[PDB]
Design a protein around this ligand. Structure first.
Ligand code: HEM
Length: 291
């Protein structure tokens, strides 16, 4: 199965900047969600989970088809809580009914990262909705209770290398774990709706203790009130990952550049862009537009 990007008929950068802006304005307005964290983090996670079902071996799953809109995928236990990001996007889709579902879910993540003061993420249009029977089965998203070998092997299926994995995991600066959702509880740091390299700094500099949470699962906790999942902590247990964690903890711009590339790649696995497709779009933030 080849998925060829097909530009929404007649649309160009200004149309997608208008969608960006609508997302960004709602992000600013609906600020109460999740004890005033806001919707940025869950929109980033929605973009990742809708892309991270991809299998490089047969091009099943991935962002192209926007299949999260079907009950098998929206009810994946791995996706518990993402309905909040979907509900956020619903009025955006109603205003811009021409955008595909995959383009909207992925653009939500780009818009969230950028509006949270993260790197620019180039973004390409042209995902096309595919039918209900193309929805990937549950079980393609990763478990959190595992070690570095698990994480490395998992991400090979998404064609990500060590550097790409460690960079992508930096998104855990954002938001928090919620016990009723995943069986883990707590934020990874203090700046959890501003995109920074804090995840790496906290991994290296907090005093972590291996504790059980109230769902009887182990997680790493600090006196500051932060947590790390076992898979997060694996990045400092494995010496290859550890070197890269130190690099990003010591170079904010390098993390931003590497995250941008890996996140674009994640959002584009499985898609064939014709030679004459538009170049990737770099959207202006609301701040840059004076809005
Ligand atoms: C080994 C890989 C990963 C594992 C096991 C993992 C696991 C988790 C878990 C258990 C949660 C908490 C869900 C909840 O209780 O609300 C979470 C949240 C989150 N993850 Fe991941 N994650 C992984 C990779 C990633 C990647 C690659 C990104 C995106 C680039 C990402 C972005 C997020 C975000 C932004 C949140 C916060 C959501 C919120 O606050 O609602 N994660 N992750």
């Amino acid at each position: 199965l080849v998925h060829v990007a097909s530009v929404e008929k007649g649309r160009s950068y200004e149309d997608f900047q208008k969608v960006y802006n609508a997302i960004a304005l709602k992000l600013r307005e609906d600020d109460e969600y999740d004890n005033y964290i806001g919707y940025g983090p869950v929109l980033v996670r929605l973009a990742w989970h809708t892309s991270g079902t991809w299998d490089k071996h047969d091009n099943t799953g991935g962002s192209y088809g926007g299949t999260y809109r079907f009950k098998k995928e929206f009810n994946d236990p791995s996706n518990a809580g993402l309905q909040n990001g979907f509900k956020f996007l619903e009025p955006i889709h109603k205003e811009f009914p021409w955008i595909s579902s995959g383009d909207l879910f992925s653009l939500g993540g780009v818009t969230a990262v950028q509006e949270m003061q993260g790197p620019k993420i180039p973004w390409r249009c042209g995902r096309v909705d595919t039918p209900e029977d193309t929805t990937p089965d549950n079980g393609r998203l990763p478990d959190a209770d595992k070690d570095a070998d698990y994480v490395r092997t998992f991400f090979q299926r998404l064609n990500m290398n060590d550097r790409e994995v460690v960079a992508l995991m930096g998104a855990h600066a954002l938001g928090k774990t919620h016990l009723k959702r995943s069986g883990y509880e707590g934020p990874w740091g203090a700046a959890n709706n501003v995109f920074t390299n804090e995840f790496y700094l906290n991994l290296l500099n907090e005093d972590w203790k291996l504790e059980k949470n109230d769902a009887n699962n182990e997680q790493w906790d600090s006196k500051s009130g932060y947590m790390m999942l076992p898979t997060d902590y694996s990045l400092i247990q494995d010496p290859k990952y550890l070197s890269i964690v130190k690099e990003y903890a010591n170079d904010q711009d390098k993390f931003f550049k590497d995250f941008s590339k890996a996140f674009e790649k994640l959002l584009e696995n499985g898609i064939t862009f014709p030679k004459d497709a538009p170049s990737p779009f770099i959207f202006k933030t609301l701040e840059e537009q004076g809005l």
